Design a protein around this ligand. Structure first.
Ligand SMILES: O=C(O)CNC(=O)C(=O)O
Ligand code: NI
Ligand SMILES: [Zn+2]
Length: 331
């Protein structure tokens, strides 16, 4: 078996290899990349997402989210407080202000130490889940707004035609902005391109060990666990690498820099944080190997998850027994 230790693999496709997206994902998996839950892909030197980022300041962040923490440094939840709208130019200025800017630090490891020591004592503001794309329409390779759709994948594999669409989201981050432990909706893949700015550090649990993370989460957030059988779907729980190590949870970490893609694989739990002002674009996608994960994906029916209507059809077709109970939570 390839990659038996479930290490995060890093790929350097040539421009020729970068033409066929599906084929390259299949290649990565042939090398065992999916066993980690996360892979990095460094694009060919000849490739670019767009010509410049000089004209993005007028994008609106309609609902910036202030991420307020509760708990202890290594085990905490965060809730999202809605703030007034601001442009990306205004957001960048805020990110760079004395209150919110990245502190002095020696290297990525030093900054990581500071993040886990001090995160809970601040409330950074995140612009998340903004529908849109920063890929140039003329970028033909790995354009996250031009991928084959999950609906078409389901149709090709299973012969079922369903409603729904599948478009990218933009994320504007600043120092300490945080993404909680989660897998994707319906345990889909995700692909994430860091367009510009400061890095993003990722933590990931191998898919074959996801239930170990779930068991620890139930122990660490016992009230949340009693409230919902899939509360990590709420995307509010953080557990530090120190606490994961103390509890023997297998995981890896890696830092993504501007110009790099990350792919998360079905049922690969991940979490992380931004180093400073940045902008990422991400979208979910599927392959034939995903279908069995979609069938088995755990759902939040307590009603806190609140997802896109695109998910209605996935649950309806792949999880018809759960559909009635799941839709009540949505409605
Ligand atoms: O970048 C973020 O804040 C979160 N991204 C993801 O969880 C992803 O791409 O799957
Ligand atoms: Ni994700
Ligand atoms: Zn729930």
């Amino acid at each position: 078996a390839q990659n038996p230790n479930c290490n995060i693999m890093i790929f350097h496709p040539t421009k020729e290899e970068f033409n066929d997206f599906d084929k390259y994902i299949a290649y990565m998996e042939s090398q065992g990349a999916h066993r980690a839950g996360l892979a990095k892909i460094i694009p060919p030197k000849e490739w670019k997402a767009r010509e410049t980022y000089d004209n993005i300041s007028e994008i609106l962040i309609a609902t910036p989210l202030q991420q307020v923490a509760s708990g202890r440094a290594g085990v905490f939840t965060q809730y999202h407080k809605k703030k007034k709208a601001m442009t990306v130019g205004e957001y960048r200025h805020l990110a760079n202000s004395k209150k919110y800017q990245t502190p002095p630090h020696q290297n990525f490891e030093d900054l990581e130490r500071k993040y886990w020591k001090n995160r809970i004592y601040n409330s950074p503001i995140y612009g998340a889940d903004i529908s849109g794309s920063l890929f140039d329409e003329n970028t033909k390779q790995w354009n996250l707004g031009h991928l084959g759709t999950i609906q078409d994948l389901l149709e090709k594999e299973c012969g079922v035609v369903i409603e729904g669409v599948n478009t990218p989201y933009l994320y504007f981050g600043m120092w300490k902005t945080t993404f909680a432990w989660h897998t994707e909706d319906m345990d889909l893949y995700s692909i994430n391109y860091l367009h510009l700015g400061e890095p993003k550090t990722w933590y990931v649990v191998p898919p074959e060990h996801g239930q170990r993370l779930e068991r620890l989460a139930r122990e660490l957030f016992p009230g949340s666990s009693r409230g919902c059988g899939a509360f990590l779907r709420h995307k509010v729980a953080l557990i530090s690498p120190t606490v994961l190590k103390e509890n023997g949870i297998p995981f890896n970490r890696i830092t993504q820099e501007a110009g790099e893609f990350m792919v998360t694989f079905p049922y690969g739990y991940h979490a992380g944080f931004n180093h400073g002002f940045n902008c990422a674009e991400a979208i979910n996608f599927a392959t034939p190997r995903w279908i069995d994960y979609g069938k088995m994906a755990s759902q939040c029916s307590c009603g806190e998850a609140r997802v896109t209507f695109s998910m209605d059809a996935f649950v309806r077709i792949l999880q018809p027994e759960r559909y009635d109970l799941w839709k009540r939570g949505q409605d």
